[PDB]
Amino acid sequence: HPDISVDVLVIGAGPTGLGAAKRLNQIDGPSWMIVDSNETPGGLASTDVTPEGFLYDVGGHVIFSHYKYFDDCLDEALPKEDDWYTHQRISYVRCQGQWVPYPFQNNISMLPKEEQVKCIDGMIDAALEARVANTKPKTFDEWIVRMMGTGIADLFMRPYNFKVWAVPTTKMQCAWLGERVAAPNLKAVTTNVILGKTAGNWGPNATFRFPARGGTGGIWIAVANTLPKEKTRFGEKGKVTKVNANNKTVTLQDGTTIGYKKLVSTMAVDFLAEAMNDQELVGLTKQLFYSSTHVIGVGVRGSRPERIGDKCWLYFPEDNCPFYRATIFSNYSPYNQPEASAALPTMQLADGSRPQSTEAKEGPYWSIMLEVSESSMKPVNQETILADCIQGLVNTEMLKPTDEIVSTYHRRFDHGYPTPTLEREGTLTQILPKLQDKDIWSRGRFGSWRYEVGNQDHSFMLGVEAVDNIVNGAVELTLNYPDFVNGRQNTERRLVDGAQVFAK
Amino acid sequence: HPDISVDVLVIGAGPTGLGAAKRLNQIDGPSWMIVDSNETPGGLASTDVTPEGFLYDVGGHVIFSHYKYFDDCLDEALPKEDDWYTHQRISYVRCQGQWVPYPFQNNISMLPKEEQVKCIDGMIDAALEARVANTKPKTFDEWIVRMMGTGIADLFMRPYNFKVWAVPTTKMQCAWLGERVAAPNLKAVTTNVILGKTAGNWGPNATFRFPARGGTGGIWIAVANTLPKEKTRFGEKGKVTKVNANNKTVTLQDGTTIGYKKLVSTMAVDFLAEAMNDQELVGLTKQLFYSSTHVIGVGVRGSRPERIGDKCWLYFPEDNCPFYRATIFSNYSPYNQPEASAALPTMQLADGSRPQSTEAKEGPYWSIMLEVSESSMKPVNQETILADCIQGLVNTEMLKPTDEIVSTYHRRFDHGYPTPTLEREGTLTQILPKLQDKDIWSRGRFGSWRYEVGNQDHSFMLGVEAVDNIVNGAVELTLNYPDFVNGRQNTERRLVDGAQVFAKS
Amino acid sequence: HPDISVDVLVIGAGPTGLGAAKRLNQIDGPSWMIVDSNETPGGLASTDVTPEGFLYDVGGHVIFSHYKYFDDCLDEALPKEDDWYTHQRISYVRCQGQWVPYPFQNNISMLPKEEQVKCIDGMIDAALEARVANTKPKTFDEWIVRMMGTGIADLFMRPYNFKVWAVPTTKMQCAWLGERVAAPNLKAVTTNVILGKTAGNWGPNATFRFPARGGTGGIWIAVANTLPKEKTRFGEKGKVTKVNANNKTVTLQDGTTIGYKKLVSTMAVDFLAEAMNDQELVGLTKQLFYSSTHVIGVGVRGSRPERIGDKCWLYFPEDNCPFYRATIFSNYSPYNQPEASAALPTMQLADGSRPQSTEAKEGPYWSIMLEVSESSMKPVNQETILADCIQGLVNTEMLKPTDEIVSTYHRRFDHGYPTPTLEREGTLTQILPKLQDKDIWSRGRFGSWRYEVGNQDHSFMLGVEAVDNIVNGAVELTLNYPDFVNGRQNTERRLVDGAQVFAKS
Amino acid sequence: HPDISVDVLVIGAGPTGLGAAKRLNQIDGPSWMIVDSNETPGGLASTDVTPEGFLYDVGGHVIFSHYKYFDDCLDEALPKEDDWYTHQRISYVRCQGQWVPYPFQNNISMLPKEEQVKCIDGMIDAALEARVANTKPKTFDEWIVRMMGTGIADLFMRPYNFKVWAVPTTKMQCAWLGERVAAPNLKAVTTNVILGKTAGNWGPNATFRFPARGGTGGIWIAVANTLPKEKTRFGEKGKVTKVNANNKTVTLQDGTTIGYKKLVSTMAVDFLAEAMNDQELVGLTKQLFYSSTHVIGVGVRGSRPERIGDKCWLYFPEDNCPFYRATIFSNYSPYNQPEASAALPTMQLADGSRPQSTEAKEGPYWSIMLEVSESSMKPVNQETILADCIQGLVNTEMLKPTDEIVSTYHRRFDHGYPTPTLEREGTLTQILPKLQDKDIWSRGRFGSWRYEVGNQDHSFMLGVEAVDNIVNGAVELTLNYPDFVNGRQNTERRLVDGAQVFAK
């Protein structure tokens, strides 16, 4: 007899577990509980703040929602018009001293003429090959080259992706990319070159919403707050230390035992394996490759420079900086950094030299968020990475040597990306059915280890669907058919379904 | 205020309506009711019987279940081992005097050598073109010719499909077929010709189940039998005569009114427009094309002939018989026809002549069911179709001139197939969303007018998923993505889900 | 017996006949004679001069020799360095107010950008189809669209060729073009577009030679001058009126009869049929299509304008002028027009009005030559063509309205181009072998009616090779395999061969 | 001054030199002379006979004339209808116990079904690749596999050609083959399979002409006999020992020196370089690959066996015999072997055992001629090759173990085939121009070293055209454009041209 008994136990209150909890709470049928070792809900979608008052999120991939249900929950959580700011999806690729609007291939008119020739030639080759193709690419790398041709592939996607995944593109599968044909739009590319134009893939239609306060972490705090407090257990009192799969009981730090009929686990699956003391799974989960992510934050004194402007996120294929992506985080909300009247001293200049004085001066302020990837194939010196990022900012002309840095931030996330390697699926098809046979739904970024559904909306929906499968027999579409869900409007599932309308 | 009020009203107690009802009954949340103008549930999945005791179903497309949910409901309806018989999926194409195992192209070694050359040459052309193809086929005919080449198309698919659909293949779309690339397996086809091999797509693992009694109609009577009687209204008492979609009320023939919050309608959508008195929808629904089906049944005296053997269904591309498909219905269950000891006089010989006497002789008996299609592009003379079918049986060597016929059956089903025309989707996108905007889920073979989800398992699930959409916010996967549901094991939805397991605690 | 007998009789003293004469004279074996109705040798390669002293040739296709034999004869005829001028092969296409260097597709960077997009889009389509092509184009038009794509084909080659041939491109064969594959060089075109580059297909090693004096006519007068005069019959005394192919005799205007063993006829083959009184050949030769060519010459007062500069020939696809090609004939030689000190009055201004002064004034002078085509499919107004040409010169900005015209020239050549129609070969494989069996070698621009071997170097060698076939059993390579002769260095046949060398010792 | 002076000197009296001399004699203009070290004209187209009375030619490639001129000289040399026998071009490939009619691929219905499947499958692959091909094959091997597909290539053309050329197919060029596209006729091949049909490429109009007497050797003796005897020097008196390219003189073995203005040399070009004492040319010519050919003749007692019948020549891809080609030489003329009444003892039985008696018995007789190739890459044991050939005859069921052999013949021709290696052209376009610059027309099988024009008709015409080039400025079409001459009817040049008609 365990100390607590519930039908459905949810481990983890990141977006995945919150998704499961939200759906359980709406269904209000089977009994349930959600636990997490952190007092603040949000998991890795939480937001940090420096002593100087600069917020930083864990990533630069803004929200794009594929589901009405996700929208319902975000809207319930933060219902006021002024709870959000809307922006156009503005991004550029840093290449040869130029900010090239995304998508790269549609904007190579900014490159020197001879390089345009090399690019067009390679894409001509790719189009002619795609005309008689009778096989599908097998690696991320083959997919890139079939889409872009050699010249364009070498300038951006190949070196960029190495910096993103910390593995070569030849080591990765390409199913996670979706099912689009690996072929160039040669006319679109020659057309912009001939017309000598540039054009980003953004406009009034292509927008994202960012929360006015508390970063992305603020979304998840407000979602979590809609849950019945008594069904949550957050903090040390909720840290799971053992999972006894055969007896269907969990044991917490404080010794509390919880019995369950079904388990939704959102912890990394390698940690779950260890927690189950299941040696066969420990071996299998150790085969799952992943990269570690360093997030660097830099707060800068001054009004937003013209050269930065309305830029949102930026891609860096080149080797003159260690980060793959930068975000102008101060463009997302005026509350991601201190107000202009707030007074801070300069810590250092961008060229690394001491400020003229140590006196606190006022703002306004702007803020940059940088991402760097580490793996066995790509080491990162944690002792120098901050300074290398800052020099990277100078090298890319994001900061003048004279810019005044008033805040710095560095954090290393051991589990950063679950890598879409060639071996991933072969390993996961061994791991997930074994857990499934024990009534354990292991789901989430590292819960199910599939990158393509490991961001916020998809993960939230992994949790939702896991519960919908457990209770209503729904297909888990997002877990197993990401292309299917991505290719459509998912409007059927709502925070208020027929069931609740008829019950009231 | 109306006489009766329910959250969800279902019109029709064919497989689709019964599906909706089963799901509503399992969930047992929103109130609901199911009405049908017929006293006997099962809709067009019902079974007829001749005065002589021969059973006939409405078609020859046997059950293949794509869903565990469907299996749960059939098994619950008919749980005994002896409620079913299992048969291998044995089918052949009648061609130039031969029974050619299906699939046709893998078995052309049975044809004359010169015909094999023509077939292979055609498939070589199609392979060569498929190698540089940069577009998808737009019509059923283009699909057929790309898969099979001209020689093979002309012998089977083309003339056969005209006979099935009662429209030319050039008039049909090809999305309903699934997503498989239209290209020939040249190597497999030439390999079998070279080896002189024949090979049916059946075996110990390719089987179907058929109910021991009452034909397919017996399945749906038993499924309906599991519902609570007081939530059903079957017979003249349940005939819908008016649908007021703005009031969300329905009026029955006896004057009863039913208010609903959501309507699952499984009547033919063209009949729904009329019942709604919605002239806009009438206009649109009249643009939908359909064929009418004649089912002919023939009871024969004798032990099962050797030439017939274990054959299940048979295809007829050639123009020496009016039917496109025949079924040896007596092979499906010994209770589809009378016992050997039953005495029946001979009605006629297969060559059409009278028999000498009126003497009632004994069996055993075997039984053939034939299907013929009719449309405005292919009329059928109802007055001679029976005699034409019988002569077709003689032409195809299924019956000898002297075989003794002891029972005949003929019925015309006006809405037979909803035709997958080139125009169908354009029209449905104007119709179904307009109905949806009124909280009307029009679903079924003719409720939603998509052939590819219009047989028993799919239709049943259309009903189940419609309810799941209404109540649980489920995706209607079968309605909009038949290729998705047909390509996977649909095991998630069960007659007993977690919701029920947990609630009984 | 006839008045004169020779082994080989040659009719015509144009390039083709003179070629036959030259080879016969070099071999100096069989006896021979060459006749022509013009006292001045050179046939249609002759040069006219206006009363004001401007020379005009018959066309603007400059010499490119494919044969050392041809070079030998021109050099023997005009041996001095000062008998010739050398020029780079400079040409442009007039398009949308601009002079675009030939070849057109390599220079579209000159057109507006939105137009370059259409051109490249079209060539992209053509490159993609060329990748999977398994047929050869059947028509000039098909060949054009496969090489260039629709956009580019529409800007230059289609409308230009209609103006040149006076029949639609869809009505012509494409073998005469050579054997190069009809596919676009997409990379070269896009590369130039991207680099913003223009590039003409000329330079220090892409040049032509033009005679210093007397135009091309001067070459042929001088080549003829090397023949033994007693074997020539030029003038009214050499006009053939009758050919009796059965007797192998010819009758001249003055009643003189010439008997031959082998006849090399370079007159137009349709006229030959008539002279033969051969009704079957008359019928066959009338199936051959040809266009008529108008040559217009314009003499202009002024030093050569900068806008003209070193231009040699110029192409005009557009509608604003009736000519297809123009030639700055004064760039070819200072002796193609009068010296600066020559005094001539202005006949008219280029805008058509009368000049202010009737007074003779001095030069310098420059000179334009224009070509206009006409046929039954593309009629031309003969009465207005001169004025229309001059207005065309104003329309294309070659002349200013105020330019002073001091000389004009206009001549119509009835047989201008023998047209490479789809029908040409079928006809010629009846005509040529039929004459062949009479021992008549009918050769030349209209002798054998194949355009692609109808210019000076090729026609000359047609004559030479005919003789070499008659005497030495040589292959007639030029007549039957123009791609073969055009793709190689023809260095073997010389004005002094081993035969002459070994005999002189 | 030299002992003799002529305008054109021709060295060698094989088909190539006789062609040259024939054209010179027709033109009867410039003075000329033809020398050869052999008293009997005909070069390697000469014919040996065994002591027992069996004739053997040097090869089994029958005459197909591409020129009227050649026909004229053959007709003049041997004008009687009874000077020739005509026969259908009947050939077969020995494969897995069967005689398969040529062409092999239209006749694979004779092979086991499983093997038919593998063949058709490989040809399907080939047809599908040829549908999208945009390059030309670079090697003989690539050409074969693209025409036939893998299965068929491996059964016949690949192994057969190794035995022919004595070098692998991968090491040879493919321009010598002609300009036909490398693609399968898939429908013809599958059609004959489906119908169970066999069809050879012969019939009443696909015939060849063979000399009634003396073998091919009699053709050339007779041709030579039409030349003015005083213009020939054949035998020891005509052996060239030195060629002084610079003074244009030739020195013979007997000491006599001959001056020339133009030289037509038809000796092997590697010997010409040696005779010229030109070490630059020696070096180049030693880079030319060639194989050595062994010809084996077998004379057999008995009427022609039914199993042989009307077979003319036969191909042998398999390794149960050393020869690549066999010829039923007794089928070509009843005078290639002794009359039936001639008496000969049996020398051995086909299985290698002695005859029961050494008594001489009568015939009739039939005769087989075999070809074996030798090179650095494929050694032949000169001392056992004869016996191995005879065993090969038993292995291929051409002879029964009991067949009585009454005559044997074996001869090694050191210069057999000039091999169409990949390097050939690179080497030849250095060698011939240099000789041309010295007014030397080196022409012929080994004079110019191009196999594709090294048989009788082509070689003869090389000699004719060389003279026509020297005298009349003719193009040497056969030497430089063999596809051109092979694709047409060459009717223009005749033994009586206009120049001779008019000279009368």
Rounded CA-CA distance D42/D26 in Å is 19
Contacts of B470 in chain A (CB under 8 A): 498
| Gap from C124 CA to chain A (nearest CA, Å) | 8
Which token pair is B104?
């046709």
How many pairs of residues across B and D have Cβ atoms under 8 Å apart? Answer: 52
| Cα–Cα distance, D447 to B288 (Å, whole number) | 82
CB contact burial B33-60 (16+ within 10 A = b; e otherwise)? bbbbbbeebbbbbbbebbebbbbbbbbb
Q: Which residues are bridge partners to C292 per DSSP?
A: C374
**Tokens 């070079």 — which residue?**
C71
Cβ atoms < 10 Å from Cβ of C180: 10
The answer to whether the CB of B38 falls within 8 A of the CB of B479 is no
Chain B closest-CA separation from residue D155 CA (Å): 18
Are the C-beta atoms of residues B447 and B265 closer than 8 Å to each other? yes
For the record, the structure tokens of B237 come out as: 């008492």
Looking at the DSSP assignment, which residues form a beta bridge with residue C372?
C294
CA neighbor of B15 nearest in space, from B65, B51, B50:
B65
Helix boundaries (H) for B327-474: 385-395, 424-436, 456-472
| Subunits with 3+ C-beta pairs closer than 8 A to B | A, D
Nearest CA in chain C to D484: C484
Residues of D in contact with B150 (CB under 8 A): none
Determine the distance in angstroms separating the CA of B187 from the nearest CA of chain D, rounded to an integer: 6
Q: Residue A493, exposed/middle/buried by CB under 10 A (0-12, 13-18, 19+)?
A: buried
Nearest to A23, CA basis, from A502, A485, A437, A499: A499
Collect all residues from D whose CB is shorter than 8 A from any CB in C. 7, 29-31, 69, 131-132, 134, 261-262, 468-477, 481, 484, 490, 492-494, 497-499, 502-503
- Residue D498 near residue C466 (C-beta atoms within 8 A): no
The rounded distance, in Å, linking the Cα atoms of D213 and D219 is 9
B66-69, long-range: CB < 8 A, 24+ apart: B66/B457, B66/B458, B66/B461, B66/B485, B66/B486, B66/B490, B67/B457, B67/B461, B67/B485, B67/B490, B67/B493, B68/B489, B68/B490, B68/B491, B68/B492, B68/B493, B68/B494, B69/A473, B69/B461, B69/B464, B69/B490, B69/B493, B69/B494, B69/B495
Helices (H), D132-278: 140-148, 150-155, 157-165, 186-195, 216-224, 269-275
How far is residue D430's CA from residue B237's CA, in Å, rounded to a whole number? Answer: 105
Nearest CA to A495 among A456, A459, A458, A468?
Answer: A468
Residues facing A365 on adjacent strands: A301
Strands (E), D358-472: 360-361, 365-374, 404-418, 440-442
For the CA atoms of C40, C41, C45, C50, the dihedral, rounded to the nearest 10 degrees, stands at -10
D220 a known binding residue?
Answer: no
Ramachandran area for residue C431 (φ above 0: left; ψ -120 to 50: alpha; else beta): alpha
Interface of B with D (CB under 8 A): 113-114, 116-117, 120-121, 124, 127-128, 131-132, 186-187, 190-191, 193-196
Task: Say whether C424 counts as a known binding-site residue.
Answer: no
Distance (Å, rounded) from C-alpha A435 to C-alpha D140?
Answer: 59
Write out the two tokens for C219. Answer: 């070459």
Residue to substitute from A8, A492, A493, interface B, most B β-carbons within 10 A:
A492
> Bridge partners of B98?
B95
User: CA D410, D412, D413, D416: dihedral to nearest 10 degrees?
Assistant: 100
**Whole-angstrom distance, CA of residue C443 vs CA of residue C432:** 9
Work out the burial of residue D320: count CB atoms within 10 Å of its CB; fewer than 13 is exposed, 13-18 middle, 19 or more buried: exposed
Q: What is the CA radius of gyration of chain D?
A: 24
Sequence-distant (≥ 6) Cβ neighbours of residue B348 within 8 angstroms: B354, B355, B390, B405
Q: What is the dihedral of CA A481, A485, A490, A494, to 10 degrees?
A: 40
Nearest to A194 among C113, C128, C186 (CB): C113
End-to-end C-alpha distance for chain D, whole angstroms: 36
Report the alpha-carbon angle A423-A429-A435, nearest 5.
Answer: 130
**Separation of CA B336 from chain center:** 19
User: Contact at 8 Å (CB) between C403 and C300?
Assistant: yes
Q: At what angle do helices A456-472 and B456-472 cross, to 10 degrees?
A: 110
Identity of the residue in C116, C128, C195 whose CB atom sits nearest the CB atom of A127:
C128
Chain C contact set for D7 (CB, 8 A): 498, 502
Q: Can you tell me the distance from the alpha carbon of D410 to that of D388, in angstroms, rounded to the nearest whole number?
A: 12
D128/B124 touch (CB, cutoff 8 Å), yes or no? no
**Phi, psi (deg, nearest 5) at residue D20:** -55, -45
In one-letter notation, the amino acid at residue B322 is P
- Is A307 strand, coil or helix? coil
Using an 8 Å CB-CB cutoff, list chain B residues near A493: 473-475
CA dihedral sign of residues B328, B329, B333, B336: negative
- Strand ranges in A226-341 using DSSP code E only, listed in sequence order: 232-234, 240-244, 249-252, 257-259, 262-265, 290-301, 313-315, 325-327
CA–CA separation, A407 vs A343, rounded Å? Answer: 12
Task: Give dist(CA D116, CA D108) in Å, integer.
Answer: 6
Instruction: Return the percent helix, strand and coil in chain B, to nearest 5.
Output: 35, 25, 40
Helices (H), B248-306: 269-276, 279-285
Q: How far B113 CA sits from the closest chain D CA (Å)?
A: 6
Q: Could you tell me which of C250, C198, C219 has the C-alpha nearest to residue C460?
A: C219
Feature table: binding site of B for NADPH = 66, 89, 91, 102, 201, 313, 315, 417, 445, 455, 458
- On whether C91 is known to bind a ligand per the annotation, the reply is yes
Is there a contact between B128 and D127 if contact means CB atoms under 8 Å apart? yes
C308: nearest Cα among C386, C408, C400? C400
Which parts of B244-337 fold into alpha helices (H)? 269-276, 279-285
**Residue D240 in marked binding region:** yes
Q: Which residues pair with C367 in a beta bridge?
A: C299
Kindly report the number of other CB atoms within 10 A of residue D403's CB atom: 21
Handedness of CA D206, D211, D212, D216 (dihedral sign): negative
Cα-Cα-Cα-Cα dihedral of B48, B54, B57, B61, to 10°? 180
Q: Report the greatest alpha carbon distance in chain A.
A: 76
CA geometry: angle at C102 spanning C98 and C107, to 5°?
Answer: 65
Residues of C in contact with A124 (CB under 8 A): 127, 186-187, 190
Q: Do C444 and C462 form a contact (C-beta atoms < 8 A)? A: yes
Helix (H) or strand (E) holding A98: strand A98-101
Task: Please tell me which of the candidates B134, B473, B490 has its beta carbon nearest to residue A493.
Answer: B473
DSSP structural state of residue D462:
H
Closest by Cα among B501, B493, B445 to B469:
B493
Asked if C57 contacts C217 with a C-beta cutoff of 8 angstroms, the reply is yes
C120/A196 Cβ within 8 A:
no
8 Å CB contact of A187 and C124: yes
If 0-12 CB within 10 Å is exposed, 13-18 middle and 19+ buried, where does residue C266 land? Answer: buried
- Cα dist from C279 to C47, C242, C285, C433, whole Å: 35, 14, 10, 16
Instruction: Let me know: does A361 contact A343? Beta carbons within 8 Å.
Output: yes
Of C117, C131, C132, the CB nearest to A191: C117
**Region at C17 (left for phi over 0; alpha for psi -120 to 50; beta for the rest):** alpha
Radius of gyration over every alpha carbon of chain B, rounded to an integer in angstroms = 24
Q: Which CATH code is given to the segment(s) C7-505?
A: 3.50.50.60
Structure-block tokens of residue B408: 């005949």
**Interchain proximity C29–D493, CB inside 8 Å:** no
Q: Quick check: C475 and D473 CB within 8 A?
A: no
Q: How far is CA D315 from CA A246, D92, D99, D163, in A?
A: 74, 6, 9, 10
Report how far apart the first and last C-alpha atoms of chain C are (Å, whole number): 38
Angle, helices A216-224/A68-77, rounded to nearest 10 degrees: 80
DSSP-based three-state secondary structure for D108: helix
User: What residues in A contact B69, CB-CB < 8 Å?
Assistant: 473
> Cβ-count burial of B179 within 10 angstroms (0-12 exposed, 13-18 middle, 19+ buried)?
exposed
- Inter-chain touch D193–B194, beta carbons under 8 Å: yes
Q: Could you tell me if B269 and B17 are in contact, meaning their C-beta atoms sit under 8 angstroms apart?
A: no
When scoring B27, B263, B472 by the number of chain A Cβ atoms within 10 A, the one with the most, hence best to mutate, is B472
- Cα separation, B153 vs B142, whole angstroms: 10
CA B417 centroid distance within chain: 8
Neighbour tally for C92: CB within 10 Å: 18
CB contact under 8 A, A29 and B476: no
DSSP C172: B
Which of these, D195, D281, D205, lies nearest to D243 by C-alpha position?
D281
Bridge partners, residue A325, by sequence: A315, A371
Q: Residue A451: CA atoms inside 13 Å, Cβ hemisphere, count?
A: 23
CB–CB of C122/C151 below 8 Å?
yes
Structure tokens at C433: 């072998």
Question: Which CATH number is D7-504 given?
Answer: 3.50.50.60
Q: Shortest Cα distance from A504 to chain B (angstroms)?
A: 10
Q: How far apart are CA B205 and CA B207, in angstroms?
A: 6
B22 to chain A, minimum CA–CA distance in Å?
Answer: 14
Q: Is the CB of A474 less than 8 angstroms away from the CB of B474?
A: yes
Mutate to test the interface with A, among C194, C195, C197 (most CBs of A within 10 A): C194
Q: What is the 3-state secondary structure (H, E, C) of D250-309?
A: EEECCCCEEEEEEEEECCCHHHHHHHCCCHHHHHHHCCCCEEEEEEEEEEEECCCCCCCC
D202 in Cβ contact with D478 (< 8 Å): no
Breaks (C-N over 2.5 A) in chain B follow: none
Q: How many Å apart are CA A389 and CA A392, to the nearest integer?
A: 5
D455 marked as binding residue: yes
Task: Give the integer Cα–Cα distance in Å for B416 and B449.
Answer: 11
D490 is in an annotated binding site: no
Q: What are phi and psi of C35, to 5 degrees?
A: -120, 155
Domain ranges of chain C: 7-505
Are D497 and C132 in contact (CB < 8 Å)?
no
The coordinates were experimentally obtained by X-ray
Say how many CA atoms lie within 13 Å of D374 toward its Cβ. 14
Q: Verify whether the Cβ–Cβ distance D502 to C476 is below 8 Å.
A: no
Which of C118, C132, C190 is the best residue to mutate to test the A interface, defined by the most A CB atoms within 10 Å of its own CB? Answer: C190
- Residues annotated within the binding site of A are 16, 36, 44, 59-61, 66, 89, 91, 102, 105, 157, 160-161, 165, 180, 201, 205, 240, 313, 315, 325, 417, 445, 451, 454-456, 458-459
